[PDB]
Amino acid sequence: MSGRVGDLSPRQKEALAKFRENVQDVLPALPNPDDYFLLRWLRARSFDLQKSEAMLRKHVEFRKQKDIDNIISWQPPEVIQQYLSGGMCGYDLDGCPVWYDIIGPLDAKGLLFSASKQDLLRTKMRECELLLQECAHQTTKLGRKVETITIIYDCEGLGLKHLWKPAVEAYGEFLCMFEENYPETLKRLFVVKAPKLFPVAYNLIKPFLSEDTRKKIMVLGANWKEVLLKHISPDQVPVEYGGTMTDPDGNPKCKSKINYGGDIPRKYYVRDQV
Numbered sequence: 001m002s003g004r005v006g007d008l009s010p011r012q013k014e015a016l017a018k019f020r021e022n023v024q025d026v027l028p029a030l031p032n033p034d035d036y037f038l039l040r041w042l043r044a045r046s047f048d049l050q051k052s053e054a055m056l057r058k059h060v061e062f063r064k065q066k067d068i069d070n071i072i073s074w075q076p077p078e079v080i081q082q083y084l085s086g087g088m089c090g091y092d093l094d095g096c097p098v099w100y101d102i103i104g105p106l107d108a109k110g111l112l113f114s115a116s117k118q119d120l121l122r123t124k125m126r127e128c129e130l131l132l133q134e135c136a137h138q139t140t141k142l143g144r145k146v147e148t149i150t151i152i153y154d155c156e157g158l159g160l161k162h163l164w165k166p167a168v169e170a171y172g173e174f175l176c177m178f179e180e181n182y183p184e185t186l187k188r189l190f191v192v193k194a195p196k197l198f199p200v201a202y203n204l205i206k207p208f209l210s211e212d213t214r215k216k217i218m219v220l221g222a223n224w225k226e227v228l229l230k231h232i233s234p235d236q237v238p239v240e241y242g243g244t245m246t247d248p249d250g251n252p253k254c255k256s257k258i259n260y261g262g263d264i265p266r267k268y269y270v271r272d273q274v
C-alpha cells in the first residue's frame with residue numbers, strides 16, 4: 001500500500017506510531033506535525049525508523065540554522081529578486097500548486113558574480129516554504145490534504161553556459177537541500193522544450209536526486225502543451241505554456257507571477273571570480 005494517511009499497512013501503521021513516540025520531543029518545533037507530515041519522512045526512508053528519525057532531526061537543526069519559521073518575510077537582494085527566474089503560477093487539476101522553472105534565460109554566472117551562494121540557496125528555501133504555504137491554503141480551500149507540487153521545467157535555451165562548473169555545484173547544493181528538507185513534496189516535474197544537451201546536463205545533477213524524485217521526472221516531446229493540459233486546466237496555465245492565463249495587463253507570459261531572468265547588468269557584480 002501507498003504509505004499515505006488512509007492507506008497504511010499494519011507494518012506502516014505500527015512504524016508511524018513508534019515514529020511519533022520517538023520524535024515527540026522535537027514536534028513542538030515543527031509546523032503542523034500531523035500524520036501526513038510524519039509520513040513524508042517515513043516514506044523517504046522506506047519506514048526505517050532510525051533513518052527516518054535521523055533525517056527529521058537533521059531537518060530540525062536546518063530549520064533553526066536557517067531561521068525557516070521567518071523566511072517567508074525575507075525578501076532577497078535586488079539582483080536575485082529581479083533576475084532569478086521562475087515562479088508560482090496556477091494550480092493543477094488536483095489542486096496542487098504549480099511552479100515554473102525557466103532555465104534558458106537564467107544568467108547563472110551573473111548571479112554567482114552578484115550574490116552569495118548562501119543568499120541564492122536561501123532564496124530557493126524560501127520558494128519551497130512559499131509552495132508549502134500554498135499547499136496548506138489549498139488544503140483548507142478544498143477540504144482535503146494538498147501537500148505536493150507540480151513543476152514545469154522549461155529547458156528551452158539550455159546551453160553550455162549553464163553547465164559552468166560553479167553553477168552546477170551550487171545547483172547540486174540546492175538539490176541536496178531540497179531532498180533533505182522537503183521530502184515527498186514533488187508530485188511531478190515536466191521537462192519541456194529540452195534541447196540535445198539535456199541528457200548530459202541531467203547526468204550532471206542525477207547524483208543529487210533521490211530515486212523518488214527521479215521517478216517523477218517526465219521529459220516531454222513536441223506535444224508538451226497537450227500533455228500539460230491533461231494535468232492542468234487551461235485557465236491555470238500561462239498562454240506562453242499553452243493555456244489562457246495572462247497578467248491583468250494582458251501579457252501572455254504572466255510576468256506578474258513568473259520571472260523570466262535575463263542577463264545581469266554589471267552594476268550588480270560584487271566579485272571578479274568564483
Ligand SMILES: CC(C)=CCC/C(C)=C/CC/C(C)=C/CC/C=C(\C)CC/C=C(\C)CCC=C(C)C
Pocket residue numbers: 103106107108109111112117120121124153158162163166167168170171174178186189198201202204205213217
Ligand atoms: C544556487 C541556485 C539554485 C541558482 C543560482 C544560479 C545558478 C548557479 C544556476 C545553476 C545553473 C543551472 C540551472 C543548472 C541546472 C540546469 C538544468 C539541468 C542540469 C537539467 C536537469 C535538471 C532537472 C531534472 C531538475 C531537477 C529539479 C528538482 C527540483 C527535482
Ligand SMILES: [Cl-]
Pocket residue numbers: none
Ligand atoms: Cl578545476
